């Protein structure tokens, strides 16, 4: 209806929008974004597209596409008459003779359904399914092309009851068109039907057999698009209806082997996704047996690079990537049983003079490692030094994936004595950490970190060279590589422990780290691995970290507080206040815990002048249990380091621990139970009020069956410590816990924790011996677990044992000790005077 004048100036505007020079283009678009705010404009756009057939097809289409963008944004304020007019024009004129016009109309229909929503245009689905039978191929083709994108956008919408589920006609209506003469039609049909498989929508599950039959009929179509979509369909079926597909499986996999070799990359990629998805299934192991000899070479050949990847480098998902993942899974499934089909390719690939072939070989060697390790062992004496040598190859990609492969054989490398394989590997690998190509830097540093997790103490002779190359890496690593260098340094620190605590190493390492720390910002993204790095470094250096702990402490306090403020704003009103990643706060808390434990009372000048106790109190009831775990650990370490700052808040903390003393959160409950013990020892007799609110819970916990060893040990130790500082309150309870207490602590080292716990059990025996007299054999067993007790604790054991011997009498003690095992009897006898 809108027509005549103004249309000349709109045609002028379109001509201007098609300007050759950018200057007019990027000065005309302002006029367009001023005109969108007048909804009548859209009538002229759809009119130019649909009806002004005297103007050229590009201009008409461009009008349509401008109208597309006007729907992509601020479609909210479109008038109902305008929307109905565009709906009507597009949906009537779907099969225009020009394919460009046809596709413009298709994307208009798509966008008008994608923005907005389907139930605001509900006649669309029936109306264009009725056009689907049309005798004009173009109208049928365009209707299907729109349908496909509607399905791709809105699968879980049509599955839901929000539109009375029109799928129930669409699915069979589609299924009829698998038969159709045109390959494009068949492609659209199966592409529509594919979207609903994983949703396992009922409308398709109830025709699964018709669907599978039409797939088998299409299997022989030498059109690539059809085979692509059929591969996607068969991939999805492996996940959902494995049961219905199983009887046919051998034919399927023969087809899919011929399809993975197919001369098109996309077809091949889907056919390989097939193998990846199948190898995950539990039935697989017996399925592929008669095809593995034909499958494995196809995957190996796929693991070569394409020439296109060669030229690009010197994608996120490739045929190579998928083939290698499939081979890794097949390795983990068949273990050693895979080797006879793959080793003969290896001993050819690995020595080839075409470097890409050699590369595919090293990659295959790495990919099978996890599953095939045991059967690979007798060849590693040849392979590992060859891989070392390949770290010298002129082509960088070889060096990179060789680093990774060696990393995946680290466990065997460290089992052999250091001079054989480990020292050569480490020398060459440190050398290539300083390689000139960033790919090699990344791969070498990652492989080296992976190695350092397993070399452990064996690294200490090399620390000088290690730290030299590492601290030098700070100057060359620009972006991504620097983060992995933090990972490597943290792994080195965790791997060697206190053997790093020497001032020359500190002088090498701390200046660049503290530089990066000071110049990194609260809102930055690099400092997460650096926090983990410094947690490792400080936990290893302990007291040697003292000159550097100021900025990290204040920064971490800031992180915890900022996280808590963001979380508050989020819990009050989410729309403007997105929640923070509490991982930052968790690593900050763990790092402060390590600082306290490693530096001791030297942390007082930082605990005093900071709100760390307020923030910690703010953490201990956070609904994420890892936060609570970290916070209780930090509570205990502050208790140990400088309790004078903590003593005023004990009345606030102790009830919270009384609430969270709960073993269904094992990891949390451990640290909480332990903090109670450290706190009781620092408080002393002042603990009398807080004993009953925790004692019943501890007694329940230690008697819990099938409970992990660490929690049980810490529970017993804390019970003993509370009994040490408050014996009257705990003493009536020994009847109920002495048996598992000794069953646990008989296994633990003679550290100060055990000393505190046994001082506690002795102090409690001095108030109530009966609760031990009930079970005294287990106390004898536990005391026998002591190798080197303190002299006064040894006197206390003597006084208990003799006092109970004189209570029971000589002949009764004889019978009571007759069935001790010999080490028990004899240690107890010699060490305490029988």
């Amino acid at each position: 209806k809108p027509d005549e004048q103004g249309l000349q100036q709109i045609l002028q505007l379109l001509k201007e929008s098609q300007s050759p020079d950018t200057t007019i283009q990027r000065t005309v678009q302002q006029k367009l974004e001023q005109l969108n705010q007048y909804p009548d404009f859209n009538n002229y756009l759809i009119f130019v597209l649909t009806k002004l057939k005297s103007e050229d097809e590009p201009t008409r289409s461009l009008s349509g596409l401008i109208l597309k963008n006007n729907v992509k944004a601020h479609f909210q304020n479109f008038p109902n008459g305008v929307t109905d007019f565009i709906k009507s024009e597009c949906l009537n004129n779907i099969g225009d003779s020009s394919p460009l016009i046809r596709a413009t109309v298709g994307i208009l229909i798509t966008t008008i359904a994608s923005k907005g929503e389907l139930q605001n245009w509900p006649d669309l689905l029936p109306k264009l399914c009725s056009l689907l039978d049309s005798e004009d191929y173009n109208t049928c083709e365009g209707a299907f092309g729109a349908l496909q994108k509607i399905c791709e956008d809105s699968a879980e919408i049509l599955d839901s009851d929000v539109l009375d589920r029109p799928l129930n006609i669409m699915i069979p209506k589609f299924l009829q068109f698998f038969k159709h003469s045109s390959p494009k039609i068949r492609s659209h049909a199966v592409a529509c039907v594919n979207q609903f498989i994983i949703s396992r929508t009922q409308a398709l599950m109830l025709h699964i057999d018709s669907f599978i039959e039409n797939l088998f009929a299409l299997a022989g179509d030498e059109e690539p698009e059809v085979r692509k979509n059929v591969c996607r369909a068969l991939v999805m079926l492996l996940e959902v209806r494995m049961d219905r597909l199983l009887p046919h499986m051998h034919n399927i996999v023969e087809y899919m082997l011929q399809r993975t070799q197919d001369q098109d990359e996309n077809v091949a990629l889907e056919a390989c996704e097939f193998w990846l998805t199948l190898a995950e299934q539990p039935i697989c192991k017996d399925v592929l047996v008669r095809h593995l000899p034909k499958l494995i070479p196809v995957l190996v050949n796929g693991m070569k690079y394409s020439d296109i990847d060669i030229i690009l480098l010197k994608s996120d998902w490739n045929l190579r990537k998928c083939s290698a993942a499939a081979l890794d899974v097949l390795a983990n499934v068949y273990r050693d049983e895979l080797l006879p089909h793959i080793l003969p390719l290896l001993k050819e690939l690995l020595f080839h003079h075409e470097w890409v072939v050699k590369e595919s070989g090293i990659l295959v060697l790495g990919a099978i490692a996890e599953g095939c390790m045991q059967g690979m062992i007798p060849y590693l004496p040849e392979l590992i030094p060859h891989l070392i040598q390949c770290l010298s190859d002129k082509k960088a990609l070889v060096r990179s994936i060789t680093c990774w492969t060696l990393s995946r054989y680290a466990h065997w490398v460290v089992s052999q004595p250091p001079d054989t394989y480990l020292k050569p590997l480490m020398t060459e690998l440190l050398k290539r950490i300083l390689d000139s190509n960033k790919r090699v830097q990344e791969a070498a540093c990652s492989a080296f970190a992976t190695l350092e997790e397993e070399a452990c103490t064996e690294l200490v002779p090399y620390l000088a060279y290690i730290l030299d190359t590492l601290v030098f890496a700070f100057s060359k690593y620009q972006h991504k590589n620097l983060l992995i260098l933090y990972d490597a340094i943290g792994t080195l620190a965790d791997s060697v422990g206190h053997h790093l605590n020497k001032p020359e190493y500190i002088q090498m390492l701390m200046p660049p780290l503290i530089q990066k720390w000071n110049m990194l910002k609260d809102e930055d993204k690099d400092l997460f691995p650096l926090l983990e790095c410094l947690s490792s470094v400080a936990t290893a250096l302990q007291s040697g970290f003292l000159p550097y702990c100021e900025p990290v402490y204040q920064r971490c306090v800031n992180l915890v507080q900022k996280t808590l403020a963001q979380a508050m704003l989020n819990n009050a009103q989410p729309d403007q206040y997105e929640a923070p990643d509490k991982d930052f706060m968790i690593v900050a808390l763990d790092l402060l815990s390590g600082l306290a434990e490693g530096l001791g009372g030297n942390i007082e000048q930082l605990v005093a002048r900071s709100n760390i106790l307020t923030l910690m109190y703010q953490c201990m009831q956070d609904k994420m249990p890892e936060v609570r775990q970290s916070s209780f650990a930090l509570l205990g370490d502050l208790t140990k380091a400088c309790f004078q700052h903590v003593k005023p808040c004990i009345a606030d903390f102790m009830p919270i621990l009384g609430t969270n003393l709960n073993p269904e959160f094992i990891s949390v409950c451990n640290n909480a139970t332990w903090a109670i013990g450290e706190i009781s020892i620092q408080m002393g007799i002042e603990m009398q009020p807080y004993i009953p609110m925790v004692l019943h819970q501890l007694v329940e916990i230690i008697n819990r069956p099938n409970t992990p060893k660490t929690l049980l040990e810490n529970t017993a130790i804390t019970i003993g410590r509370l009994g040490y500082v408050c014996p009257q309150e705990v003493a009536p309870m020994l009847q109920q816990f002495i048996r598992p207490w000794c069953t646990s602590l008989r296994n633990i080292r003679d550290n100060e924790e055990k000393d505190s716990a046994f001082r506690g059990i002795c102090t409690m025996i001095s108030v109530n011996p009966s609760g031990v007299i009930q079970d005294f054999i287990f106390f004898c067993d536990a005391v026998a677990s002591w190798i080197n007790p303190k002299d006064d604790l040894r006197d206390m054991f003597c006084k208990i044992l003799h006092g109970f011997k004189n209570q029971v009498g000589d002949e009764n003690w004889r019978r009571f000790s007759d069935q001790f095992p010999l080490p028990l009897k004899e240690r107890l006898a010699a060490f305490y005077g029988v």
């Binding site: 190579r320 990537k321 290698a324 990659l363 990919a367 994936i401 990774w404 791969a443 990652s446 990972d487």
Partner: peptide, 7 residues
């Protein structure tokens, strides 16, 4: 951890 394996 998510160390840069090649697949």
């Amino acid at each position: 951890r998510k160390r840069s394996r090649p697949y």
